[PDB]
Design a protein around this motif. Structure first.
Motif, PDB file in Angstrom:
ATOM      1  N   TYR A  84      15.644  41.381   2.643  1.00  0.00           N
ATOM      2  CA  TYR A  84      15.755  42.666   3.320  1.00  0.00           C
ATOM      3  C   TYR A  84      17.110  42.886   3.980  1.00  0.00           C
ATOM      4  O   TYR A  84      17.527  44.038   4.142  1.00  0.00           O
ATOM      5  CB  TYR A  84      14.654  42.797   4.376  1.00  0.00           C
ATOM      6  CG  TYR A  84      13.316  43.219   3.814  1.00  0.00           C
ATOM      7  CD1 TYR A  84      13.053  44.549   3.520  1.00  0.00           C
ATOM      8  CD2 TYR A  84      12.317  42.286   3.576  1.00  0.00           C
ATOM      9  CE1 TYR A  84      11.833  44.939   3.005  1.00  0.00           C
ATOM     10  CE2 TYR A  84      11.093  42.666   3.062  1.00  0.00           C
ATOM     11  CZ  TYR A  84      10.857  43.993   2.778  1.00  0.00           C
ATOM     12  OH  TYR A  84       9.639  44.377   2.266  1.00  0.00           O
ATOM     13  N   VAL A 223      13.861  62.350 -12.252  1.00  0.00           N
ATOM     14  CA  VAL A 223      13.396  63.315 -11.261  1.00  0.00           C
ATOM     15  C   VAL A 223      14.572  64.080 -10.665  1.00  0.00           C
ATOM     16  O   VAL A 223      14.474  65.282 -10.393  1.00  0.00           O
ATOM     17  CB  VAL A 223      12.569  62.605 -10.175  1.00  0.00           C
ATOM     18  CG1 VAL A 223      12.088  63.602  -9.137  1.00  0.00           C
ATOM     19  CG2 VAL A 223      11.393  61.877 -10.801  1.00  0.00           C
ATOM     20  N   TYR A 226      15.575  67.092 -12.664  1.00  0.00           N
ATOM     21  CA  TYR A 226      14.619  68.180 -12.815  1.00  0.00           C
ATOM     22  C   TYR A 226      15.229  69.491 -12.337  1.00  0.00           C
ATOM     23  O   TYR A 226      15.862  69.549 -11.279  1.00  0.00           O
ATOM     24  CB  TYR A 226      13.341  67.872 -12.036  1.00  0.00           C
ATOM     25  CG  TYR A 226      12.378  69.033 -11.962  1.00  0.00           C
ATOM     26  CD1 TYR A 226      11.621  69.401 -13.064  1.00  0.00           C
ATOM     27  CD2 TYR A 226      12.225  69.760 -10.791  1.00  0.00           C
ATOM     28  CE1 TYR A 226      10.741  70.461 -13.003  1.00  0.00           C
ATOM     29  CE2 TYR A 226      11.348  70.821 -10.721  1.00  0.00           C
ATOM     30  CZ  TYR A 226      10.609  71.167 -11.830  1.00  0.00           C
ATOM     31  OH  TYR A 226       9.733  72.224 -11.763  1.00  0.00           O
TER      32      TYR A 226
ATOM     33  N   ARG C  40      13.499  45.499   8.907  1.00  0.00           N
ATOM     34  CA  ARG C  40      13.088  45.883   7.558  1.00  0.00           C
ATOM     35  C   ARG C  40      13.342  47.367   7.331  1.00  0.00           C
ATOM     36  O   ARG C  40      12.477  48.108   6.860  1.00  0.00           O
ATOM     37  CB  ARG C  40      11.619  45.549   7.321  1.00  0.00           C
ATOM     38  CG  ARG C  40      11.368  44.130   6.846  1.00  0.00           C
ATOM     39  CD  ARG C  40      11.182  43.188   8.020  1.00  0.00           C
ATOM     40  NE  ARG C  40      10.727  41.867   7.603  1.00  0.00           N
ATOM     41  CZ  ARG C  40      11.523  40.821   7.433  1.00  0.00           C
ATOM     42  NH1 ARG C  40      12.828  40.906   7.625  1.00  0.00           N
ATOM     43  NH2 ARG C  40      10.995  39.658   7.063  1.00  0.00           N
ATOM     44  N   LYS C  42      15.250  48.952   5.232  1.00  0.00           N
ATOM     45  CA  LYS C  42      15.468  49.440   3.873  1.00  0.00           C
ATOM     46  C   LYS C  42      14.208  50.033   3.258  1.00  0.00           C
ATOM     47  O   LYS C  42      14.301  50.758   2.261  1.00  0.00           O
ATOM     48  CB  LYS C  42      16.002  48.313   2.987  1.00  0.00           C
ATOM     49  CG  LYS C  42      14.924  47.467   2.334  1.00  0.00           C
ATOM     50  CD  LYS C  42      15.523  46.255   1.640  1.00  0.00           C
ATOM     51  CE  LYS C  42      16.424  46.665   0.488  1.00  0.00           C
ATOM     52  NZ  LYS C  42      16.906  45.486  -0.282  1.00  0.00           N
ATOM     53  N   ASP C  82       6.601  74.059  -5.557  1.00  0.00           N
ATOM     54  CA  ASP C  82       7.191  73.420  -6.734  1.00  0.00           C
ATOM     55  C   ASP C  82       6.973  71.914  -6.608  1.00  0.00           C
ATOM     56  O   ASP C  82       7.860  71.147  -6.232  1.00  0.00           O
ATOM     57  CB  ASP C  82       8.666  73.779  -6.858  1.00  0.00           C
ATOM     58  CG  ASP C  82       9.247  73.402  -8.204  1.00  0.00           C
ATOM     59  OD1 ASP C  82       8.475  73.290  -9.177  1.00  0.00           O
ATOM     60  OD2 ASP C  82      10.480  73.223  -8.290  1.00  0.00           O
ATOM     61  N   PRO C  84       6.530  69.316  -8.807  1.00  0.00           N
ATOM     62  CA  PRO C  84       7.303  68.288  -9.529  1.00  0.00           C
ATOM     63  C   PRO C  84       8.620  67.926  -8.864  1.00  0.00           C
ATOM     64  O   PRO C  84       9.063  66.775  -8.977  1.00  0.00           O
ATOM     65  CB  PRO C  84       7.526  68.923 -10.908  1.00  0.00           C
ATOM     66  CG  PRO C  84       6.407  69.865 -11.068  1.00  0.00           C
ATOM     67  CD  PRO C  84       6.138  70.418  -9.705  1.00  0.00           C
ATOM     68  N   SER C  85       9.254  68.866  -8.161  1.00  0.00           N
ATOM     69  CA  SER C  85      10.517  68.573  -7.494  1.00  0.00           C
ATOM     70  C   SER C  85      10.361  67.543  -6.382  1.00  0.00           C
ATOM     71  O   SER C  85      11.366  66.996  -5.916  1.00  0.00           O
ATOM     72  CB  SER C  85      11.125  69.859  -6.936  1.00  0.00           C
ATOM     73  OG  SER C  85      10.221  70.511  -6.065  1.00  0.00           O
ATOM     74  N   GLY C  87       8.873  64.737  -6.890  1.00  0.00           N
ATOM     75  CA  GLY C  87       8.867  63.432  -7.527  1.00  0.00           C
ATOM     76  C   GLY C  87       7.559  62.702  -7.317  1.00  0.00           C
ATOM     77  O   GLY C  87       6.473  63.230  -7.576  1.00  0.00           O
ATOM     78  N   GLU C  88       7.664  61.466  -6.839  1.00  0.00           N
ATOM     79  CA  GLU C  88       6.507  60.621  -6.589  1.00  0.00           C
ATOM     80  C   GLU C  88       5.933  60.800  -5.191  1.00  0.00           C
ATOM     81  O   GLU C  88       4.954  60.127  -4.852  1.00  0.00           O
ATOM     82  CB  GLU C  88       6.876  59.151  -6.807  1.00  0.00           C
ATOM     83  CG  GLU C  88       7.083  58.776  -8.266  1.00  0.00           C
ATOM     84  CD  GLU C  88       5.789  58.415  -8.965  1.00  0.00           C
ATOM     85  OE1 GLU C  88       5.050  57.553  -8.445  1.00  0.00           O
ATOM     86  OE2 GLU C  88       5.506  58.997 -10.033  1.00  0.00           O
TER      87      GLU C  88
END
Lengths: 234, 117, 117
Positions: A84, A223, A226, C40, C42, C82, C84-85, C87-88
């Motif tokens: 990390y 992504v 897009y 931690r 990050k 929107d 899909p913009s 992402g995840e």
């Protein structure tokens, strides 16, 4: 007698579209020459899958952090701290000496002329005499509290990097993960097609780590594109 | 222990070790894993059957070197285990040996095949 | 932090804050949630895509005001996302949005109705 894609492309006259990544370049080059002829370099481009871990120490820690872990998963604390906080250590030459020393202690052969800046004296890891002087200097400081833990734990427990010898090639500076991303979703490599074939068996036990890491890298870039353009790859 | 070198193989030095280990920390503060293991040491009595004092043997390592050793490459070594002589620990040893062999075979991947049944 | 005031926006003041944080933390005494999060950091890196400096940067509150605001009572505002913009990170956001809206719908019960599809 069933041809592959390289032989199929040669018959169709498609040139400069196959990029082959392998850790057995010599074996495949001989096979390519006897099947595609003398001019086989006009159809297939062979690129190495080996990486110089001195240039990319963040890949070395990531590979060790996600190893077999026999039955009960026991990720050690010292690996987790280094995993990390490795990017923070890169700004401190004092701590990066232990990271490079840990790789050298495990047995990873460095490139000629590689130098570090332990304390205030520039040492030469690639030279066997200077490597001994650095090793002794790392024990003279390690006689009190100092900074026990973090970088010092990696140097002491440097046997965790022993399995990286098969994947290490001194003086590479390649980072094939970034090269593939530019091949498929690069700005300058817009359209025009690009077939990428990866020799997974040559990657040994690291094939699962690199395949999953590559797909995460490619999906995130898709992504970002897009609303501008499509990925257009299979 | 601490900064003294006791010889547990000798009765007197082992007694001195036990006295120095038990008498100094008579406060009951932070009885961690090691101290509570020392308290419940009787759980290790059943290991006396399959224990031999001093060989660096680890027959699992011997089997691993027999089946996947560098200098034992090829040679088709046939390994037979007398499991009934292990009593109630046969399943544990079988599972651990299989895990060790599979990990060694995975490590050898990319260079050579395990080649055994 | 402590009692001194810094400016994390400025580079030198951020460096001074880091010096204050790590200089006195050479004890490792009962690492809690905050210090463990700092060690931690990050894990927040993936948030770099959805971040935007400002103060009124919350589309969830804007959508809540559009669909259930007192100023916009009636109106009939059509809200399209929107997805899909995102992402995840869409799923999470979607769920959160719904929950937020539902809460306001419960808070306005007896005064008026949510009145949306």
């Amino acid at each position: 007698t069933s041809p592959g894609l390289a032989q199929a492309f040669k018959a169709l006259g498609i040139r400069g579209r196959i990029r082959f990544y392998t850790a057995r370049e010599e074996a495949w080059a001989r096979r390519l020459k006897e099947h595609l002829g003398t001019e086989w370099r006009e159809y297939v481009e062979v690129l190495p899958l080996k990486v110089d871990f001195y240039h990319f120490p963040e890949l070395a820690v990531a590979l060790a952090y996600q190893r077999r872990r026999l039955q009960g998963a026991e990720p050690p604390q010292y690996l987790e701290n280094a995993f990390y906080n490795l990017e923070d250590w890169k700004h401190i030459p004092d701590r990066m000496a232990y990271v490079y020393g840990a790789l050298r202690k495990a047995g990873l052969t460095p490139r000629k002329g590689l130098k570090i800046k332990y304390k205030n004296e520039n040492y030469d890891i690639s030279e066997e005499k200077s490597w001994g002087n650095l090793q002794e200097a790392m024990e003279n400081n390690s006689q009190r509290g100092d900074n026990k833990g973090g970088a010092r734990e990696l140097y002491s427990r440097a046997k965790v990097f022993s399995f990286l010898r098969a994947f290490h090639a001194p003086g590479k500076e390649a980072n094939f993960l970034e090269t593939i991303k530019e091949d498929l979703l690069g700005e300058k490599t817009e359209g025009e097609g690009k077939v990428v074939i990866l020799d997974l068996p040559s990657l040994g036990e690291a094939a699962d780590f690199f395949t999953l890491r590559l797909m995460d890298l490619l999906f995130d870039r898709a992504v970002e594109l897009y609303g501008k353009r499509q990925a257009n790859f299979l």
